Structures are given as structure tokens and as C-alpha cells.
Design an enzyme around this catalytic site. Structure first.
Site, mmCIF file in Angstrom:
data_model
loop_
_atom_site.group_PDB
_atom_site.id
_atom_site.type_symbol
_atom_site.label_atom_id
_atom_site.label_comp_id
_atom_site.label_asym_id
_atom_site.label_seq_id
_atom_site.Cartn_x
_atom_site.Cartn_y
_atom_site.Cartn_z
ATOM 1 N N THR C 137 0.818 -1.198 0.000
ATOM 2 C CA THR C 137 0.000 0.000 0.000
ATOM 3 C C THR C 137 0.864 1.264 0.000
ATOM 4 O O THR C 137 0.370 2.355 -0.261
ATOM 5 C CB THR C 137 -0.907 0.024 1.225
ATOM 6 O OG1 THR C 137 -1.764 -1.121 1.192
ATOM 7 C CG2 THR C 137 -1.738 1.286 1.241
ATOM 8 N N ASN C 138 2.157 1.112 0.280
ATOM 9 C CA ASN C 138 3.063 2.258 0.327
ATOM 10 C C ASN C 138 3.800 2.553 -0.979
ATOM 11 O O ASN C 138 4.625 3.461 -1.030
ATOM 12 C CB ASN C 138 4.091 2.090 1.462
ATOM 13 C CG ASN C 138 3.446 2.053 2.846
ATOM 14 O OD1 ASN C 138 2.441 2.715 3.094
ATOM 15 N ND2 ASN C 138 4.040 1.290 3.755
ATOM 16 N N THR C 183 -1.530 53.848 -9.463
ATOM 17 C CA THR C 183 -0.640 53.263 -8.471
ATOM 18 C C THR C 183 -1.166 53.777 -7.131
ATOM 19 O O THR C 183 -1.286 54.979 -6.940
ATOM 20 C CB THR C 183 0.822 53.721 -8.694
ATOM 21 O OG1 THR C 183 0.919 55.140 -8.532
ATOM 22 C CG2 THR C 183 1.275 53.356 -10.095
ATOM 23 N N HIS C 184 -1.489 52.864 -6.221
ATOM 24 C CA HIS C 184 -2.028 53.221 -4.908
ATOM 25 C C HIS C 184 -3.513 53.501 -5.122
ATOM 26 O O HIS C 184 -4.213 53.965 -4.207
ATOM 27 C CB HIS C 184 -1.377 54.498 -4.358
ATOM 28 C CG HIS C 184 0.036 54.333 -3.896
ATOM 29 N ND1 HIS C 184 0.358 54.002 -2.595
ATOM 30 C CD2 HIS C 184 1.214 54.475 -4.548
ATOM 31 C CE1 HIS C 184 1.675 53.948 -2.470
ATOM 32 N NE2 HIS C 184 2.217 54.232 -3.643
ATOM 33 N N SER C 314 -30.988 42.751 -12.762
ATOM 34 C CA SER C 314 -32.177 43.398 -12.213
ATOM 35 C C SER C 314 -32.803 44.309 -13.269
ATOM 36 O O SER C 314 -32.109 45.106 -13.904
ATOM 37 C CB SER C 314 -31.799 44.212 -10.969
ATOM 38 O OG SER C 314 -31.067 43.425 -10.039
ATOM 39 N N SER C 315 -34.116 44.184 -13.452
ATOM 40 C CA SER C 315 -34.838 44.981 -14.442
ATOM 41 C C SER C 315 -34.807 46.481 -14.159
ATOM 42 O O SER C 315 -34.511 47.280 -15.054
ATOM 43 C CB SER C 315 -36.294 44.516 -14.532
ATOM 44 O OG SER C 315 -37.021 45.285 -15.478
ATOM 45 N N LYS C 320 -26.354 47.352 -14.510
ATOM 46 C CA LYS C 320 -25.764 46.539 -13.460
ATOM 47 C C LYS C 320 -25.602 45.109 -13.966
ATOM 48 O O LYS C 320 -26.585 44.383 -14.149
ATOM 49 C CB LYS C 320 -26.652 46.543 -12.205
ATOM 50 C CG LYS C 320 -26.000 45.915 -10.966
ATOM 51 C CD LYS C 320 -26.927 45.901 -9.757
ATOM 52 C CE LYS C 320 -26.155 45.762 -8.441
ATOM 53 N NZ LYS C 320 -25.364 44.509 -8.321
ATOM 54 N N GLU C 327 -15.289 36.772 -10.416
ATOM 55 C CA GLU C 327 -15.525 36.529 -8.988
ATOM 56 C C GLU C 327 -15.310 35.069 -8.612
ATOM 57 O O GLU C 327 -14.717 34.763 -7.584
ATOM 58 C CB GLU C 327 -16.949 36.950 -8.588
ATOM 59 C CG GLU C 327 -17.271 38.407 -8.888
ATOM 60 C CD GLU C 327 -18.633 38.861 -8.362
ATOM 61 O OE1 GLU C 327 -19.529 38.000 -8.155
ATOM 62 O OE2 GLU C 327 -18.796 40.093 -8.178
#
Lengths: 462, 462, 462, 462
Positions: C137-138, C183-184, C314-315, C320, C327
Site C-alpha cells: 500500500t506504500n 498606483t495606490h 435586475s430589471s 448593473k 468573482e
């Protein structure tokens, strides 16, 4: 066959299926693990949907005819009669919108089927306008989760209270068993097996209190928060009424958050729990390490204890019985550790009024809670209850030891106790022999000192 | 005292001080750890500033009369003659600007001193307009780090190769020390001590490979990338010249990145180095655990090996010799594991054209390379080299083990192998003293079978 | 029904099932996750068993009649015709013994069924004496895993080479698109969308090389190592012959480790891979963050790019469209992070000649590899290929910006460029206007400077 | 100079030095980080030694003439008059003995000086036999840490409560600043700025709770547990007395652990503290990310808020103001995440009666509590307090957003809500300037609908 209108086109849905276009889209968008959300989340979604339909009918926002069948449908969901209709992936984008919709569409079509209708006719019963009424994906998803995590958490607490108690029965069972305590893995002074086993029960109990206490910040739900949690256009009476329905139907002392914007964007309550479960496995993993060490041998190891056999042993090797149970305990500890990093990462990845990383976060939180309950169950049954000790083996370990001198020292002074200790270490003779050979303590005067109990507890020298 | 005006107000810089308002303000904004940047980073800053001073003079951007002094001063910074002047916190915001400005101010003022001018007279030698001419925090700081990490990396490699070789010596030295192998901490079949030590030497050799190979990606620097990495207004002859100057004084095969934008925002090379260090420490920790186990005892533990005493043993209790060195090894391994999480986290926090979380990242990365080199040296010199073996103890382990029977099976048939074993399992009678006191193999023959070498090596059954 | 002899008693096995008592025991011992080992591990187990049967028949250790059917059985396994017979849990104790046995018993009974026999008659074909012959098994478990991980790894490499290339098509597609580099998160100087997108392709390619290179230390297998890896009673000819069978049947340049004890107890090759996959997701996660930032808006955000829609919007909210794809990319990154901690923990938990924590370790390694391949596939198809830019939006972002002064500065001197910059910042007028109002540059003389390309690349001032 | 003999040889201890061979040898064995133990740990060591000196004298174990001096010296150590003398590496083996001995030697020698004796004359005042009388590294060291961590913990609580309150002030101060909420970084519905700030104040308040509550488990000390935790030969009157002395001088409600063995081997209380700190930093980091986002710009970013400038802006480029403070906050958050992994790891590495990995654990734990308190102070004083708002910018955000339509829907019917919106989506015409230039709500009426308060609060549709 069938067909549902989706902005991405018309899709076909099996006539037997209850999920709709939206769920399919989710299936196509995020086919990551192939896992199905935990049945408890499913059950909780049912509860959440049922409680919303109700409140909606009471405030009179949902037609009482339709919202009447929706309930019986959500109840069927709650009873776990549709865990196969939830096919979306635990790891999905959209911060959980697909998990909400998968439930909305299943509860909608069943409700439609129930009042003799066509499943696909979202004009009679809209999964988005009826089932998902007075609620947003940002308050229904988390609420169902809080409920799921809470229900699940209690199950763990009881499975650990049981394990923890079985750990005590062993503490007393071995309350008289004497052995050698090891610090640095180096021989130290004597200690009782029962003192180590109580030590285990005490950390575990401390684990129960910490885990149990994480439930509090979990009791606050944000049902009623609109999208951002400002409750825009939300009926305050709906909120009060739905919150209570959730509480009674979920058996939890649920509460309505005092600040909804806060309860919407923050996720600290989730990490609080993961952190407790992590601490628990840290301890359990260490206990599982001691168990494998004491079980080592039988010939070239410590051989302090004997764990029941759970997996066939090599024939040519009699005596070799691997602590497979304590080992699987170690692995779950590692998993929980990993899940807590994943959970930590998702929590801080939150942005403004919403953390979209919640899905992978919940998958881990619920996993940890689950696998822990399971290993705890089987570890105690298939290992803990049946642990036996090799008292004789340990008794002599104390005889051939040096540390035993500390017990004797007080009755002979540091000067002689040190000489006795050094010599016995170099020559290999037990300290018991050297006291008689050198004549300083009689066989009797020695046993009245080498008292297992009085030797493992604080006290004067007399 | 001295007064230096700052857009925040007037700050009194010490007379003997070579830093300025910039550095001070940084000390105020970031009083986090109180640590000082590794002197190798300081030295690197000096090289970067020197390589820039020479390039700016060659391309006619910097006044050769002033530049000449700046180079001499930067040269002193390279020789580590002013490490005291670098006082900003390794953990700071501003993405390294404080660190960069600390080097710009120190070099600027020390240069003014050399050319007989009042320190702080930034009109003659402006730290910002002269010492920092033609560069940006975004390219000076990361390039310095690239050089520092590379230098420290090469040292770690030397010290590790030394250690890896010392392991080999132990492997040869114990090439004939038979002992009892263990799997699941359960007795197994016999194995050579020296085989375990070569097992360590090999993984470590393999670490040396992985670690060294991570140097390549650091060879590409982004010097001359300016702010974003567009090189806007930067002179290609400046870049060309400065890159060549950096490689020469740093001693590394520095190459100017092919895509300066890619090189200005990506940090994948640092996570690559930390990844290689973490892996190494994983191996190193497993090895330490093995060591502390093989040193456990004396009377109630394994006692396979003897580690040299470093901590003074129990004032009057002999035999107890804690394996402090392997222990301090394990702890460093834990530090690097945490450091890798910090680095992972700081790396992924990158945004657009710049990862502002580099300071904490670099601080941890350098710390790993440093503490690893440090224990590697101490551990090999104060432990590894003097490891002695308890040949007899391990010898008897193999002798009184119910597992050595696997090495004798072929010669006594799989039938007599169950009687000579399963019997030796209860009576505890030596598997060898049983062959004699039963008849199957003659002593002189029984030793050619239970031979330390062929018993721990691949060979036909009989 | 049925019944098989197990030291834990006689158990019943469905007449249709191919797994035996041992697998059932495993099911009862470790019912942790409920997951099934990856089909590729199954397939690889098939390959490993087939290649062993063969070598055994060639060395003449396995009856050629039985070992003849076993092969056709292992082949059916390899073809994925029995992925349901493998029911053991990925997270199990026994360092993988149950995964080996689950395969041994399925390949044994099918082989028995194939030559017209009774499935349960382990006297005709023993899953432990025939199928698991010349192997432990090893060495079988790890080998099958090395093969699984390798096969899986290649699939990822190609899925990333594709993604990475699609990242370049976008780099060129946007090679002319000008925007503001940040930057930042603070406005800086101009930069090309294509420069950022190439930046992405370059880190990804660097990811491919690193991931690809981890395959080398994975090519060394330890087949032939007995229990501890000493090859006790192992036929050197079996080893050479089986190794080659594995290589040809697995399509991998498999090799036989030079040191078997080393290749048996060390696991550093597994962590090497996890570490590479982690570094890859760190980068991908950051890229996924930039993508969500550029996609922000449409009104109150950056709105630099537009990702195709993948989930209904969304209607009441037109515009959006959540970056659900990028994500889910972030979440997989977190998972891989978590799996790498779990993997790190299992690797160092190794003891002596065997690391029993390998099962949970392999579950994570294979998971990471899998989920990455999947998100990569769908992320590129359902998002990357269809990314569009808002050139106009970005063009003006550069007009109303201040940083643009850096481009102009050279043609007006620091004195005037600073005045122009300050004023435009305080009043709110574009820098373009101030150059004409203040009369210093004509509308024409300005565009010959505000050249998108020449402005985003290094060069003299003319 | 001075000469002190050691079982390792003769070491020349500096004349002005108050440490001895023990401490020196530790410096040799562990030259890891080069750091010094936090002065609060040093102070704690002084308290422990004092509380032990008085107890040992009361119970007649310590010569009152010598003890008297030891107490006076320990008193100086408590006042931090000798922090320089503590030179051992926070990361060390020996499980704290070096740290303990460094305190035993320093106090021992300073005492001898006070009673007019040669330093190093351990015959009069033995650091081991007098200063360390009746205690063990295993109980002195952990108890000191318990006291140190508790003290630092209380400070962190003060500084956090201060910060939490300052957040509340900002919440009130911006209670009326309307802005545009975002979910998925995508425009959403309107929300009050002050609501986001109370959202922060609340999670932080919740952190204060979690963190403070972790103090309880630290209150239980194991003083008088000796080696293992059996209290073997320890006098109950000594324990009783010493515990009372520790609580009095430390200022904490110290309690003598009910199970000294449990308290000597378990480390679950430290992982509990680190868990609470990590969670807090998760929240704090999300918050910092929000801040840097709300400060992005000016021209090409969000620009919702203005953070006070700390780093001198671009020499001549106005508008660019990097959010250094929130950044340094994020980095500390990353440090604590790594520190928690180190702590987790060092905690689980425990074995039998003692966890020898405590030094690295304590070092990281203390470091977290320290760096957190440090940025919390700096961040509130140099950022949080001076945060200003761009009320107009956020105002226009709400005005020109296609999402404010959700707040007007009820008043213009779900029918006219699609025309007044979907049209404003292309023409970009103000949602308000559209109601007027179309007829539906009068200006004075349109403002009672789009009111900053009722628009961001729960209320009936119409």
C-alpha cells in the site's frame, strides 16, 4: 422537454426537473467542483422561502391563493424532498444569486405543479416575483446560511459533548494507571494516564464552550435589508413578522440586526466560528498525535495504550495495528485548517455594502462543521470508547526510569538522591536496586514513597 | 540640533544624523515593529543609488562634481558604514517610499559632508532631485530587493549545501547501523539508519535545486520603469547603462525586464521564492520531528540516537537531554509557514500598476531567507555533526521484533513462517533464538539471512 | 446478498457490487466527506494494477491464467467502467490502504466474474494475493497518485496555455487603447490597456513554466519499494519491468527512484506542485480583482471595460452586470490557498519511513488541479474572449487627468509644467485648456505630444 | 572581563554584564532573528520572580536575607531598568528555558551586587537554586507569558475602543452625507456615508467583545506545576501564596488552574487569542480596502473621501495623495494572518506533558497584540480623525445614477419606472431632470422622495 426565456436565449429544461433557466445558466457558468450544496442549506432555504411567503401573505403583498401553495412547496423542500433539484455549484460567482434562484425556481414550479399548472409558467407563480418577494439575494442567502450553520453547529456541539464525556470515562477508567510523563519527548517524572486523559477532556470542554458561544453573533439576521441593506421600500411590518417566522420554524432564537447595512456587508461572524473550529482541531490533532505515539510499537515503540482494530492487519506481522482512527482525526484537522484560510481570504475580500466571496466561504464553513461532526462520531465509537491500557508495561517504565528519583529525593536529600540517580543512569540498574544495594531505603520504605497517586500530586515531603 | 522644514511643519533633525524629515515623518506614521531593514537591503540600496549616480553622469543628467560625491557616499552605504541611519519600519505604507527616501537622504547628506557643505542643504545635493534622479520608488525599491534577496539567497544555498553534505556524511557513517523501520509509528521491517539519513540528504538536495532555480526570475529587474512601468521620459541609454552597473556591483546576472510594465506590477517571483523556502522547511521540520523521536528516552523512549547536549541538563537528574536544536528548527519552519501566508496575502493584494503591500512582503521574504540560513548553520554545527548512534539498542530492536520474520520467510516457507512468528508474538522469544531452538537455519546461516545489508535491500525471495 | 470473512466479522455485500469486506470496513471507519476519489485516480489505479499483473506474469510470480483475466479487468477499470465501485472516502485513515483495497477488490471480483466464477471467492483470485502482488500500500497508492497528478497536471497546462494566449489576443486587441495607470489606486501617468493585458499574459506564462516544471520530481516512482522502501524480497527484475509498463500505459516518462527509502517517506514533490498552483492563483486572483475594478460602474465606478453578461440583471437596474466570472476566479484562488495549507500540514506530519497523512493531502492536490482547470476553461470562454473596452471613456479620463503633465513637462520645463498642473487641479479645468488659455502649446503641438504610444514607452524628450 | 565555567567550557562574561553562561550559550545555540523579547515579557518575568521570592520566604524555603535582595532586584526588572540584559532570541529551543534562565541570571547577579558581593558568585545567590526556587521553566515561563499577554491585551482593548469611538464620530459626522452604494463593485441603490462608518464601528465594537472575552482563559495560570504539572514536592501553601502574589502585582484576576496538568500541556488559550486578533484584522483590512477605494482618484477614481496627507505628495504633481495609513493597516493585517498560522502550527506540535514550540508561538502572539495596538493608534490619529468628505461628488453620483430609480418607483408606478429609467440609461439624462422634463412629480415633491434619509431607510413602498 421544455423551454424557458433567458436573456442568453431559450434553454431546454427536463420536463421532470424543477429548476429553471437561471439554475441551468449557473450550471454552465460555474461548473467548478461538481458538489451539491449541503442538504441543511437546502432545508434552510426552504424555511427561508416558506417564512417569506407567509409574511408576504400577511402583509397582503402576496396573493393568498398562490402564496398558499408556495408554502406547501417550500415545506416539501424543507422536508428534504427535493435535494436533487439543487444542482448549482457551492463555489459560484454572483455572491450566491444562483443558490437563491435554484431554490426560487424549484419552490415556484412545485407550487405551480401543486395547484395543477404548467411548470414553466412563471406568470402564475414567479420564482422571482412571488417566491423571491420582499427579499434580495443579499438577505435571503445569508439568512438561510446563518440558519444552516446554526442548526449544523448544535449537532457538532452535542457530538462533542458526547465525545468529551467519553474522554472522561477513560480518565477515570485510567485514574489509577501510572506511567512516565514526557517533556521534550525526554523522560520526566511520573504521571497518571488519567491525568493526561482528563487533560484531553478539559481542552475539549473548553472547545465546546468556545464553539457554542460563536452562535450568538450568528443569531442576528438581516432579512428585510434590501439590496444594500438600507431597507429601501421594505415594509417594517414585513421584517418583524418574517423574522419571527424564521425563528419558530428554524428553532433558533433568531433576531433582527439593529443595523442592517452593517449586517449586510460584514462577515466577521463567519470567521468567528471558523476560528473556534480551527482551535478545536488544533487540540484534537495534538490529542490524535499523542494517541498514535502511545499506540506505537508493539516491540520498537512506546506501547502505552491499545486502540481497537479497525482495519485488517498484515498476516506476517502480528501486532501491527495502525491507529487509523486517530490518523483520520489528524487529516480532518488539516482540512479545517485549510478551510479557515480559504474562509479568512473570502471574508477580507469583501467590498463596500456586499461581500461577493461568501459562496466559497460558506462551502468551507459548512464543510468544516460537517466533517468534524463525522470524525467525532466515528472516532469516539470506533476508537475512544474501547481504549485499553498496558498498566504493566507502564508500571515498569517507571521502575527503569530515573525521574522517579524526584519522588525519592525528599526522603534521602539532594546529595544522595543525585548519586543514586547518576549511577543508575550510567550502569543501567533500576533506582530501586541501588537503594537496597547501597542500603538507604528498604523495599517497604520505598513502596510507601512510590505511591502512584501521592507521587503525581502536590504535597509536602511527608 | 538642526531644523528641516516639512509640509507638515518644522522637525528638528539631530546634528549627527544623516537622515531627514522624510525619514522622520515615516518613523511617526509607521511605529509598527520597531525593527530595522536587513543590512543586506541597506547595502543594496547603496548599490542601486551608486549604479544610478554613475549612469546619470554618463548620460549627462547629473553634475559630475556632485555625482562624484554621491557615489563615494553610496559606496560607504554599500560597505555598511551607515546601517544605523536606516530607521524606517520594515512594515510601512507608501509602498517603500520611506525606505527609498531614507537611503536618498542618508546618501545625500553624507555626500554634502564629503564636499564640505552643511548637512540638510538639499539645494546643493537634493536627495530627491540628485540621489533619486531618473528613478522611482517603484523601480529603485523593488530592484534593491531583487538584489538583496538574490544575495541572501546565494548565501542560504551555500549554508544548505554544507548542511546537505553533512547529512550525507552521517548517511555514510551510519551506512551499516541496522535499526527497526516504522510506518504509522508501528513496527515494520528492518531498515538501515544511514538509509534514513540519505533520505534526508536527498530531499534537502532536492530543496537546494528548487530554491536555487527560483533565482532566475529575480534576475529580471525593472530599473527605469519610472512610476507605472512605461519608462515615460526615461532615457534608454540610462537604463542600458544602469542595468549593466547594477549587475556588475551586485555580482548577479541582472537582466533588464522585457516588459517593464509587467515587471512593475507583478510580484509572482517573490511568492515563487517563498514557495520554495516553505517547501524546504516542511522537509526540514519532518526531519527534526524524526530526530527528537529518535532521541527520546533514555529509559522510556526510542533512544535510537544521541544528540550533543547544548542546554545544561537537569541540575542533578541525569539522562534527560532535550533536543533543543531540532526544536528550534521546527519553530523556524513554523515562522516560514506564516511568513508565506503573509507573502501570499500581500502579493494578491496588488492593484493595477503597483503592489503597495510589498514592504510587509519583502520584510517576510527576507526574514525567511535569513532565519533559515541562521538555523541551518547553527543546527549542523551544534547538532548534526555530532550525532552519535546507539547501535546496540537498535540492534536488539531488530532482534526482538515480530517483524524481522518477513526477511526470513522465503528460507523457511510461508508455512513455518507463521509458526516461528505468531509464537514469538506471545512468548516474546527472540525470532532468532526460535530458529535455533526449533531447527530451520543454522546460526552461521541465520546470520547470512538476517544480514544488515541484504535485509534492507531489494533481492529475489530466495 | 453475499458474505465475506473479515476479522471484524462476516459482512454482507450487494451481489451487484464489486468491492469487498475491506472497502465496506473503510466506508464504516471513515464516513467523513462522502466524496468519491477522482475518476483519474481510479483510472490510474487501474493502470497501476494492470502493469503489476503483467510484470508478475512475466517474472512468473502470477499464474498466467488468472493474471490474464485480471488485466482485462484492470483495463475495464482504466476505461472508467467502474467509477461507482470506488466508494471509500478521499479523507481516510490508514495512509491509503483502503483506496488500494477498494481497487484490489473491484479488479479481483471483475476478474473472477470474467472467467466465470463467484465474486467472493478470493481463493481463485485474491485481491490481496494476486491483484496486490509484488506491491504494498506504500508504493501502489503513491504511484497511482503520481500518475493521476501528472495526467491531471498536463490538462491544466494546456487549459492555461489557451487562456494565456487568449489573454494576448486581448493585449493586441487593446494594444492601441489608451487609459490612466493607477498606483495606490491614485491617478498616475498614462498606460495602454494592452500593456496591462500583456502584463497578465506574461505572469500567466511564467505560471505555466513553473507548473510544468513541477512534473519532473513527480516522474520518479517508488514501485518495488516494499513496506519501508527497502525492497525486501522484491525482485529487481519485477521493478524494472513494472516501471516500464507504467510509463507506456500512462504516457508519462516515469522513472524508478534511485533511492527507494527516500522516495517512500518524502512527500516534498507534492508540496512543490501545490506551491506552484498557489502562486498561479495568487496572480489570477489579482487579475480577477483588476477585472472587477475596471468593470465597476457603470455610473459610479471606473467603467474601463465591459465583460459579457453571464447572469440575468435586475430589471429596474439597467447597466448593473456583475463580473460573476472574475468573482468565481477569486474564490477558486482562495480554495487553492486553503488546500495548500492543508497540504503543507499533511506533508510535515510525516513520520519515519511513511507519511500516513497522504490521503487528505492527495484529495487537496487533485482538487486544486481540478477546480483550476475548470474555472480556467469557463472563465476564458464565458468572459475573457469577449472583453470589450470603452476607449472613449478612457480617452477622456486621460484628458481630465493631471498626470498627463509628465508627458507635456519635457516640452515646457518643470517651472511651467508644475504651474499648469497645480492650477488645473485646483480649478478643475483640463490641462489641455490651460495650455491654450495660458498660450504655451497649440492644439496641434499638444496632440503631437499626447501620442498614446510614444507617451507610454521610454524615450528621449523629442 | 569575568570568567564563568560552563559544562561546555569557560566563557568570558562581560564585567558590566548581569547575565551569565546560561544566557550566553543560548545566544550561541539560537542566533536566529537577533530580536529581543518584548519588554512586557521582561517585566512579567520580574513579577513572576518576585512573586516566587516572597512566597518561598513566607513558607521558609528561601533565606530571608538573600530573598530580600532578590525581590529588590526583581523589582528593578519590573520597572524595566534592565531590558538590555535580556538578549536571548525570541525564537529558541529548550521551550523557554533560555528566556527563564536569562531572567534568573540577571536578577541573581543584580541581587548579589546589591548585597555587596561579586557578580557571578552563584554560591551566595544561585540563579538556579534561589531565583528559580520552587518553580520550573514549564510553569514560570508560561505564567509570565499569561501575564504579559494579558497586560498587552488590555492595552490593545483601550486603543481599539478609542478607535471604535472615533469611527462612531465619523458615523455621526457623515450621518447625512448621501453617496451611491455598490455591490459587486456595481452601482446599486443609495446609502448614507455615515451608515458605512457605523457599519465599521459595529464590527469593530464586535471585535472588542471577542478579543476581550479571550482574556478569561488566560486568567488561569499553572504556577507550581513543576515539570509535568503534577506539582510533585511542591508545597500547596507556596502555590496558594504565589498565585495570590502574581494577581496582586500583575493587576489581573489570576486564578490557579484547577487541573495543573491540563494547564501545563494545553495551549488552546493562545490559539484562542490569536483567533480573535486575526478576525479583528480581517475586518480592519476590508475597511482599509474600502478607504483606499473611496480615496482613489482624484480625476480617474472614486474620490468619495479625502484622507489627510502624511507622505509628501509628488514633488510637483498635485492631486496624488496615497492612502499610506490604510495601506500600512492592510499589511499589519497580513502579518497577523501569518502569525496565526505560525501559532496554529506551533500549538498543534505539542507533545505529551509539554509543548516545546511555545517560544515561536508566544513571540508571534505578542507581536500581533503589539503591532495591532501600534497601527490602531497611528491610524486613528493620523488618518481616521481627519477624514473629510466630498459631499458634492457623492451627491452627483446619486443624481446621475440609473439606480436611484428604485427609490422613485412606488410613486410613479412600476410602469412609468421602466421608461423614466431605461431611457435615462442611454441619453444619460438625469433621473431627476427627467421627472421634471416629463411630468410625474414636482421638484418640491421630487425632493421629498429622493430625500437622503428616507431613501436610505426602511419604509412602506408608497
Amino acid at each position: 422537454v421544455r423551454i424557458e426565456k433567458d436573456f442568453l436565449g431559450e434553454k431546454e429544461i427536463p420536463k421532470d426537473a424543477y429548476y429553471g433557466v437561471q439554475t441551468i445558466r449557473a450550471t454552465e457558468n460555474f461548473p467548478i467542483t461538481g458538489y451539491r450544496i449541503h442538504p441543511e442549506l437546502i432545508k434552510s432555504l426552504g424555511i427561508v422561502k416558506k417564512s417569506a411567503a407567509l409574511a408576504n401573505m400577511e402583509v397582503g403583498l402576496l396573493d393568498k391563493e398562490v402564496g398558499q401553495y408556495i408554502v406547501k412547496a417550500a415545506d416539501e423542500v424543507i422536508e428534504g424532498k427535493w435535494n436533487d433539484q439543487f444542482i448549482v455549484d457551492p463555489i459560484q460567482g454572483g455572491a450566491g444569486t444562483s443558490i437563491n434562484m435554484n431554490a426560487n425556481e424549484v419552490i415556484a414550479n412545485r407550487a405551480l405543479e401543486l395547484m395543477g399548472e404548467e411548470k414553466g409558467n412563471y406568470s402564475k407563480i414567479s420564482p422571482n416575483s412571488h417566491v423571491n418577494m420582499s427579499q434580495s439575494t443579499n438577505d435571503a442567502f445569508p439568512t438561510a446560511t446563518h440558519i444552516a450553520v446554526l442548526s449544523l453547529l448544535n449537532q457538532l456541539i452535542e457530538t462533542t459533548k458526547y465525545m468529551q464525556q467519553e474522554f472522561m470515562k477513560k480518565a477515570d477508567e485510567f485514574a489509577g494507571v501510572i506511567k512516565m510523563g514526557r517533556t521534550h519527548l525526554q523522560d520526566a517524572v511520573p504521571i497518571l494516564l488519567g491525568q493526561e486523559f482528563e487533560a484531553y477532556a478539559r481542552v475539549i470542554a473548553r472547545d465546546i464552550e468556545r464553539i457554542a458561544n460563536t452562535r450568538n453573533n450568528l443569531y442576528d439576521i438581516n432579512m428585510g435589508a434590501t439590496a444594500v441593506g438600507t431597507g429601501l421600500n421594505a415594509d417594517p411590518e414585513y421584517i418583524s413578522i418574517v423574522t419571527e417566522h424564521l425563528a419558530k420554524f428554524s428553532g433558533h432564537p433568531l433576531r433582527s440586526a439593529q443595523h442592517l447595512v452593517d449586517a449586510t456587508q460584514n462577515t466577521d461572524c463567519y470567521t468567528e466560528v471558523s476560528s473556534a473550529l480551527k482551535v478545536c482541531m488544533i487540540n484534537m490533532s495534538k490529542i490524535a498525535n499523542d494517541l498514535r505515539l502511545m499506540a506505537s510499537g508493539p516491540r520498537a515503540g512506546l506501547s502505552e495504550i491499545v486502540l481497537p482494530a479497525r482495519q485488517p492487519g498484515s498476516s506476517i506481522m502480528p501486532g501491527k495495528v495502525n491507529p487509523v482512527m486517530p490518523e483520520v482525526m489528524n487529516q480532518v484537522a488539516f482540512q479545517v485548517f485549510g478551510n479557515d484560510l480559504t474562509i479568512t481570504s473570502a471574508s477580507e475580500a469583501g467590498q463596500f455594502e456586499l461581500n461577493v466571496m461568501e459562496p466559497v466561504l460558506f462551502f468551507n464553513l459548512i464543510q468544516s462543521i460537517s466533517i468534524m461532526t463525522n470524525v467525532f462520531k466515528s472516532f469516539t465509537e470506533n476508537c475512544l470508547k474501547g481504549i485499553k491500557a498496558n498498566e504493566e508495561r507502564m508500571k515498569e517504565y517507571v521502575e527503569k526510569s530515573i525521574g522517579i528519583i524526584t519522588a525519592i529525593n525528599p526522603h534521602v536529600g539532594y546529595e544522595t538522591a543525585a548519586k543514586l540517580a547518576r549511577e543508575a543512569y550510567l550502569t543501567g540498574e533500576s533506582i530501586r536496586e541501588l537503594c537496597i544495594k547501597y542500603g538507604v531505603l528498604t523495599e517497604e520504605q520505598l513502596n510507601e514513597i512510590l505511591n502512584p497517586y501521592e507521587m503525581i500530586h502536590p504535597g509536602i515531603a511527608g
